[PDB]
Amino acid sequence: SVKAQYKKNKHRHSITNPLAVLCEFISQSIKSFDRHFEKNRNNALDFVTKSYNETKIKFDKYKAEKSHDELPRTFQIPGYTVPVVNVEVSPFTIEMSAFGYVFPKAVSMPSFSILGSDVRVPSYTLILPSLELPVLHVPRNLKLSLPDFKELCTISHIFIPAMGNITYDFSFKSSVITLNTNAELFNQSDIVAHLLSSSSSVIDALQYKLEGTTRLTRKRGLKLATALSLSNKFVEGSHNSTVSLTTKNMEVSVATTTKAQIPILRMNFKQELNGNTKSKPTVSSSMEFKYDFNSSMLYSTAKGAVDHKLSLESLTSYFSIESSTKGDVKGSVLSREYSGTIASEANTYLNSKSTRSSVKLQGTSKIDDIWNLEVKENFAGEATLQRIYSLWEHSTKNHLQLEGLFFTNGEHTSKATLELSPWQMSALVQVHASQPSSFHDFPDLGQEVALNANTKNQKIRWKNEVRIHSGSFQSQVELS
Amino acid sequence: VLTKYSQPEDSLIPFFEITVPESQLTVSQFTLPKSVSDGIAALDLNAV
């Protein structure tokens, strides 16, 4: 028996949404434009008086005006009526002075009469001097102020569905299986959802319970709170997501909790996310993961934990970022122990004056007591508006082989640093930190560079040493 | 800003050094998504 009944409701809420906040907003720019206009007039002022200086002595005194005068250009447009869209166009008059060359004159245009609020007629009054008289003076005080655009500042009906209940139940009868899944949804004003699935069977794996709630309001922010829970013998899930919008501040809480029920692999993790943000945005992320491997047939097992913690501080003053994670793991494979772990720490501080970055890394892993000691994978660098410093990776490698004659191996560098400042340049590089071993005395190296520069002051030291079997060579170079 | 005739220790050539001292540029407080206004139009981000 399958149910899909649905009570149709075409009615909807029409929430009025104001737009006048936008309507005044651009209008605010207009007022600035208004004063900007008089600034333009000031620029025009810097010419107008001078232009007056070029008019009188050419027109008022010299006989060069009032010769074959013409009627001033006056163009009239009668108003019109449009009943379909109901628009009244007022008569419009355009005036140019006849004297000169189509020089603009005083223009004045009011607003028209239309239907609704779609466009705005540019009603203004600009006054400009006429060349028919020698006196030219643009009124700086008289500016041009256009009316603000009224593009439906209060007319807007956001449509919100006013719905019934979405009903869908699935029920089936048999002799070995019994499923009764019910899904319902409430849509009258807000978002209220819940799912229920009931499974009954002879087999334990086929019999379980699934349920979940989902709520989302709209009246006061979009506050969501969805939690899930699975009742199964093999999957035990508890997922918790709540997003709260209190119309002033947002909150996110993700409590993810699920565990595995596999006999040969006991995995158990955990996820928590709280993106809290009230005054300064911040991130609280810490990822948790545990696992348990055991293979009797393959005589292998693995047991470790992997975790991370993320810290973020979006502070208005500075921004410091914190991250670290651990990849710990242990195991035994064919009567041979397995090890290996990871440690991370990347500290990166930023500022408008100085920045620092140091990366600390740990990868000490061994394969059955072999090839280990990978330590000190750190490097640091600092940049200031007075000094620069860098010391990059200078790790060490010292590993042991358990097959043969206990062969030792590993080659690495020493510290090697760069120092920068006005009048002081330093390059102090010691490198070639090798490890001699068996098989005819593996070479032992080493190299030192001392560069010290203060413009003309130049100290250069270069030392090298090489060791092979039953011999050696060393060389030095010095510039003072 | 100072100007001085000097003789460097690691440079046998005398020079003239013009030095602008340290400056502390002042960056006044400002507001972020509450109500922005750049001298042209007041924009209320909270209202929108």
UniProtKB/Swiss-Prot annotation, chain B:
Cell location: Cytoplasm; Secreted; Lipid droplet
Gene name tied to this protein: APOB
Span of the entire protein shown here: 3796 to 3843 of 4563
Physiological role: Apolipoprotein B is a major protein constituent of chylomicrons (apo B-48), LDL (apo B-100) and VLDL (apo B-100). Apo B-100 functions as a recognition signal for the cellular binding and internalization of LDL particles by the apoB/E receptor.
Clinical disorder: Hypobetalipoproteinemia, familial, 1: A disorder of lipid metabolism characterized by less than 5th percentile age- and sex-specific levels of low density lipoproteins, and dietary fat malabsorption. Clinical presentation may vary from no symptoms to severe gastrointestinal and neurological dysfunction similar to abetalipoproteinemia.
Highest rank taxon of the organism: Eukaryota
Protein name as annotated: Apolipoprotein B-100
Post-translational modification: Palmitoylated; structural requirement for proper assembly of the hydrophobic core of the lipoprotein particle.
Subunit structure: Interacts with PCSK9. Interacts with MTTP. Interacts with AUP1. Interacts with CIDEB.
Induction field: Up-regulated in response to enterovirus 71 (EV71) infection (at protein level).
